[PDB]
Amino acid sequence: TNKEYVCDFTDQLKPTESGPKVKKCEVKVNEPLIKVKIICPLKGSVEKLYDNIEYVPKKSPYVVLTKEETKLKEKLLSKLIYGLLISPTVNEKENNFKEGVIEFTLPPVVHKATVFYFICDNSKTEDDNKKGNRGIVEVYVEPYGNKINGCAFLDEDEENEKIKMKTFFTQNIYKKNNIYPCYMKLYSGDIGGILFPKNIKSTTCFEEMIPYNKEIKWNKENKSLGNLVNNSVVYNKEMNAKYFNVQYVHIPTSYKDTLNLFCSIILKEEESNLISTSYLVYVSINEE
Ligand SMILES: *[C@@H]1O[C@H](CO[C@@H]2O[C@@H](C)[C@@H](O)[C@@H](O)[C@@H]2O)[C@@H](O[C@@H]2O[C@H](CO)[C@@H](O)[C@H](O)[C@H]2NC(C)=O)[C@H](O)[C@H]1NC(C)=O
Numbered sequence: 001t002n003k004e005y006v007c008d009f010t011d012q013l014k015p016t017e018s019g020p021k022v023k024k025c026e027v028k029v030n031e032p033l034i035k036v037k038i039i040c041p042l043k044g045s046v047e048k049l050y051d052n053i054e055y056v057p058k059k060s061p062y063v064v065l066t067k068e069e070t071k072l073k074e075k076l077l078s079k080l081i082y083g084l085l086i087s088p089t090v091n092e093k094e095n096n097f098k099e100g101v102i103e104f105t106l107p108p109v110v111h112k113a114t115v116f117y118f119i120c121d122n123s124k125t126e127d128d129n130k131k132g133n134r135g136i137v138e139v140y141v142e143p144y145g146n147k148i149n150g151c152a153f154l155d156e157d158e159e160n161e162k163i164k165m166k167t168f169f170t171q172n173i174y175k176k177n178n179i180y181p182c183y184m185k186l187y188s189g190d191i192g193g194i195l196f197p198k199n200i201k202s203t204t205c206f207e208e209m210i211p212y213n214k215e216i217k218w219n220k221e222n223k224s225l226g227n228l229v230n231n232s233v234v235y236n237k238e239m240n241a242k243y244f245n246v247q248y249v250h251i252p253t254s255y256k257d258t259l260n261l262f263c264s265i266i267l268k269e270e271e272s273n274l275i276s277t278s279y280l281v282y283v284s285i286n287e288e
Contacts, residue, residue, distance in 0.1 A: 005029070007137045008039040013122035014049045015130035020123035023135045030142040032108040032191055033235065033248065037090075038137055039101045040120035048127055055097040056119035061086055061104045062242070064139075065117040072117060078243045080114050081141065082164040083107030083195075085241040105235060108191045108248055109145035109168060148248070149190055151182035151281070153197035153265075169195060183282040189253045194281065196245040197267060205263035205281050206234055206249060212260055229255050229285065251285055259285040 007025030027036055038060075043050045057063040057074050064080070065072040078084055085105040086095060093099040097120075116139050122132030152169035156162075157176035166172060173182060175197075186192045196203060206225040210218075226232050232255070235248040264278040 003033060004035045004037060006037045006039070007118075007135075009120045009135040010039055010041055013041060013053070013120065013133040013135050014046075015122070015125055015127045015132045017130050019131035019133050021133045023133050025135070025137045027137065027139045028142070029106055029110075029139065030144050032145050033105060033233075033250065035103060035105045036139060037101060037103045038097075038118055038120070040097050040135065041122075042098075042100050045100070048125075049132065050122055050125060052124040052126075053120070053122040053132065054124070056121070058097070060097055060118050061095070061102045065119070066115065067117070072119075075116070077104065077116065079161075080116060081106065081110060082161065083109070083168060083193075083244055083246055085236050085244070085246075087236075087238075087241050106141065107145075107246075108148045108193060110141050110143055111164075111167075112143055114141040115139065145191075148193040149186055150184045150193040150195075152195040153182070153200075154195075155198050165195060169193060181280055181282055183284070185284050185287060186249070186251050187286055188251055188255050190251050191248060192251070192283075193246060193248040196239070196247070196265060198245065199268045200245055201266045201268045203239075203263065203265045203281075205265070206247065206283075207237065209261040209263050209283065212262060216262065225249060225261075225283075228259060228261070231255070256286060258288055259283075260287070261285075 005027045012023045040055050041050050043053050063074050064077045066075050084107055089095055090101050090103045095102055118137040120135035123134040125132040148169050150169045151171045151173055152165055153173050158174055184192050208222040209225055210220050210222045231252045233250045261283040262280050264280050266278050
């Protein structure tokens with residue numbers, strides 16, 4: 001709902017005479033860019049009722065559980081799903097169950113079925129003859145999507161995670177002798193994305209787009225994609241998500257006008273340099 005699945009255990013786990021029960025939140029994902037949010041009541045948030053609650057993994061959502069043999073074992077979510085977005089904060093609080101909630105946004109493309117788990121377990125809290133419930137989240141991600149319209153600035157000079165970086169975007173750009181600037185061509189309804197270089201220093205994509213018509217007029221006032229294309233969405237626009245130097249964009253179906261835009265990227269260079277180099281990135285929308 002609203003591209004967000006919520007598992008809210010706030011009112012699911014309190015001790016009752018018939019507890020413990022198992023409260024299972026089943027999240028099934030088969031479409032792009034879904035945000036998953038999990039709320040787990042904190043010990044002490046109500047006087048007695050969560051006194052022995054525990055959440056697993058402690059480092060959720062960075063670390064998740066998967067089922068191996070018959071056991072739940074900890075794995076890094078970013079290794080399970082390339083391009084997944086974990087932001088450091090949720091409403092300006094650490095993205096960690098010690099603040100009561102975690103969130104992450106799944107990417108435009110998932111190649112293989114992936115199933116992982118979180119636990120929010122109040123079944124060891126007792127009060128008189130009551131016991132709390134055991135909360136479990138099962139996230140089942142089905143394969144979905146196809147390559148992302150956009151560009152992957154790849155770390156090698158020429159042509160297990162390196163394989164994903166090379167199959168995820170429609171245009172690959174290698175470090176050495178690049179003769180093809182990134183050109184992301186989108187139409188109404190499309191998802192786009194750029195994996196920015198590992199040694200990126202800064203970029204004006206996509207907060208400072210410059211419109212142009214055939215020839216570049218360097219003086220033209222810049223504007224964000226969100227302000228140029230009403231109801232567009234940019235993901236990880238802060239580029240503060242862990243692991244992946246990526247941004248995604250979505251162009252709404254409502255948007256049927258044509259734009260030609262550019263932004264640019266600066267790399268980390270030897271401090272010996274007097275002159276810095278900005279490399280242009282081209283974005284077109286509904287190019288006729
Ligand atoms: C920018 O878009 C908003 C919201 O867009 C609407 O919802 C989308 C899902 C899509 O279906 C669009 O066709 C819609 O316009 C516009 O604001 C709204 O205007 C509509 C009139 O059609 C009205 O019914 C809504 O209640 C309004 N909602 C809000 C939050 O204002 C807004 O006018 C657009 N801005 C420009 C400059 O075009």
